[PDB]
Design a protein around this nucleic acid. Structure first.
Ligand code: MG
Ligand code: MG
Ligand code: MG
Ligand code: MG
Ligand code: MG
Ligand code: MG
Ligand code: MG
Ligand code: MG
Ligand code: MG
Ligand code: MG
Ligand code: MG
Ligand code: MG
Ligand code: MG
Ligand code: MG
Ligand code: MG
Ligand code: MG
Ligand code: MG
Ligand code: ZN
Lengths: 84, 115, 60, 177
RNA sequence: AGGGCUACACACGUGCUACAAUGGCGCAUACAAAGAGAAGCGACCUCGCGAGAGCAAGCGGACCUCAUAAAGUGCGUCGUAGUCCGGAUUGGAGUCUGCAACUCGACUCCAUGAAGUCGGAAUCGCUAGUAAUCGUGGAUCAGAAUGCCACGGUGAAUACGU
RNA sequence: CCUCCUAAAGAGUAACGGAGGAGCACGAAGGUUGGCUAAUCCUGGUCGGACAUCAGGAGGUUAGUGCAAUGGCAUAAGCCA
């Protein structure tokens, strides 16, 4: 994990979008490619559409998700089993 | 003998015997005994009731046994309930820490299941 | 009770770590040393998350 | 007899005040306590039925009655009359003394004891509970245990409802979560 | 830009680590060779259990640094147990590189403590400083070896014969 | 040879009429004295599950009877000593 002294990494464009969306009522999802950003407390209640490689998966942010990276909630591989 | 709700081996050295508690390894065993003023090569049988009580008092400082078990179960349930990558890996009984699954992964997957 | 058939059943002393001492009939024969009892067990007395943590580790 | 004097002197008063009973004879009583082991794995080994009956004897202070199959049951491979359990009925002095050993000694020794279910009343006032390991009773020697036996304990009460039964049990500081 | 090359009912090849007592653990203490280094190697000191961090010498080097070799030896302990064997897996907490460690890094600490008790048919290497075993260094490289390339230490058995 | 129906409310009553059983078992499964009461389901309860043993309730013989069927059987003929 990222060193504690560096703090939590979030992409600047996503931080700006989240500040804008918290400041003006809950809008449509936040379309983002920043799977690598940390989920901040000020995203709770927002719906964030995280790219998985092909699509933007909706992620409703709850408190239990805080501190995780957004890509943790948008699986990138499709697998339903072999011999199926 | 009876510490943290469990019986500790009576014939082993105290260091080894305390690692029978769920949540006590070798380092925590040394720490407990050095905080209770008891030599590590002392067999549990060669211990006064009062010294066993001191040992019990020092074990209650660490989360062990059923408290530790439900902590771990809560952490895994939280992962599974969130639906994060690690939660899905726990659900499907696959390695959670990035290991290859093309081969190996038998510890998580269990015995080979032929087609 | 019938004669001759039952376990020997006599009074002994149960001494707990917390200074509780109770005399009790039992089949154990000897005296007991209790590591816990009803007067010191934490359930009987009453001696029984992400946002907090994120904000404490990432003090800006 | 400690808990029987506690019942006669404190429990009756508490319950009479709470439920506004006219006669003390209405206060619920602990009528009996039955300890039962189902040892269905003794159809293979009869010697497993005895050793369980040894534990019960140690735990209750009372030779147990071997129970047997009311009817043949092909799912469990039991013919009618086959001995597949043991039980003790504790009454009076022995009942109150086992009740004290259970509340004050044995239940504190249950692994990860977080309380007993206040749900386990039969609808008529009687309380059943299970014990997963017979080791919680200090009569059962750990260095002498052959197999991890459990048992069930029923407390049959004269209470008319579950409300009254749980008021009676909680008057003895029964550890209901 | 984001994802994939890291998928996972499964099968094979090449390895690593074991299954222990010719061993494990603890303390103490001997004896190498080779090699690399400037956006690099980084001492000493201080802090941290630790990975590390802070400060900061020396060295383009038979000078400084990486950098105590380990097996060994002495003392003590474990006493044949799935164990004081094994160290997979997972939870929690961290460090560092790097715009960035979710997919998918290495490492640390606490906890956890799986299979495995010498491996079916079959099959491989090796004739001497070899095999076996023990550590060490380098290229690639921000970071990322159980692989590759190289270096010493200990050091066998057997070869009648075709 | 036994039980039921045909068989017409006493007995009896035929057909290559309609359905089943017997050719034993038991020194207790006989005698007697003392006691006892079922099936089934609901709720609670370690393993334990549809179904074992335990507790309570409902039910009231819908059980049981050494073996068919019928008629009996609680004062039990049923179950224990
Ligand atoms: Mg450890
Ligand atoms: Mg990898
Ligand atoms: Mg690209
Ligand atoms: Mg590849
Ligand atoms: Mg080890
Ligand atoms: Mg050089
Ligand atoms: Mg095994
Ligand atoms: Mg072995
Ligand atoms: Mg040759
Ligand atoms: Mg090597
Ligand atoms: Mg290099
Ligand atoms: Mg490198
Ligand atoms: Mg007639
Ligand atoms: Mg007529
Ligand atoms: Mg005629
Ligand atoms: Mg009679
Ligand atoms: Mg008769
Ligand atoms: Zn106590």
């Amino acid at each position: 994990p990222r060193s504690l002294k560096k703090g939590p990494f979030i992409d600047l464009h996503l931080l700006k979008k989240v500040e804008k969306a918290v400041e003006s009522g809950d809008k449509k999802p936040l379309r983002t490619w920043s799977r690598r950003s940390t989920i901040f407390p000020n995203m709770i209640g927002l719906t964030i559409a995280v790219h998985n490689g092909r699509q933007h998966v909706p992620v409703f942010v709850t408190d239990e998700m805080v501190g995780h990276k957004l890509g943790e909630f948008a699986p990138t591989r499709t697998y339903r089993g072999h011999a199926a | 003998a009876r510490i943290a709700g469990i019986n500790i081996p009576d014939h082993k050295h105290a260091v080894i015997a305390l690692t029978s508690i769920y949540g006590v390894g070798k380092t925590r065993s040394k720490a407990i005994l050095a905080a209770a003023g008891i030599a590590e090569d002392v067999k549990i049988s060669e211990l006064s009731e009062g010294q066993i009580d001191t040992l019990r008092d020092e074990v209650a400082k660490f989360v062990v046994e059923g408290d530790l078990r439900r902590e771990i179960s809560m952490s895994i349930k939280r992962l599974m309930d969130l639906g994060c990558y690690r939660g899905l890996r726990h659900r499907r009984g696959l390695p959670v820490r990035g290991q290859r699954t093309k081969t190996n992964a038998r510890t998580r997957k269990g015995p080979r299941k032929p087609i | 009770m019938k004669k001759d058939i039952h376990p020997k059943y006599e009074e002994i002393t149960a001494s707990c770590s917390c200074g509780n001492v109770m005399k009790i009939r039992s089949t154990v024969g000897h005296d007991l040393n209790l590591d816990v009892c009803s007067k010191c067990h934490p359930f009987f007395t009453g001696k029984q998350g992400r946002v907090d943590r994120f904000n404490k580790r990432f003090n800006i | 007899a400690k808990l029987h004097d506690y019942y006669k002197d404190e429990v009756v008063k508490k319950l009479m005040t709470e439920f506004n009973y006219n006669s003390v004879m209405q206060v619920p009583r602990v009528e009996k306590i039955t300890l039962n082991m189902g040892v269905g794995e003794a159809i293979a080994d009869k010697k497993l039925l005895d050793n369980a009956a040894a534990d019960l004897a140690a735990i209750s202070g009372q030779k147990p009655l071997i129970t047997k199959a009311r009817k043949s049951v092909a799912g469990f491979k039991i013919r009618q009359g086959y001995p597949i359990g043991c039980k003790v009925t504790l009454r009076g002095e022995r009942m109150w003394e086992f009740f004290e050993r259970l509340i004050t000694i044995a239940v504190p020794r249950i692994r990860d004891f977080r309380g007993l279910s206040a749900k386990s009343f039969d609808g008529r006032g009687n309380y059943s509970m299970g014990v997963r390991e017979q080791i919680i009773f200090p009569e059962i020697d750990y260095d002498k245990v052959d197999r991890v036996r459990g048992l069930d304990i029923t407390i049959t009460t004269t209470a008319k409802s579950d409300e009254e039964g749980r008021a009676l049990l909680a008057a003895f500081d029964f550890p209901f979560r």
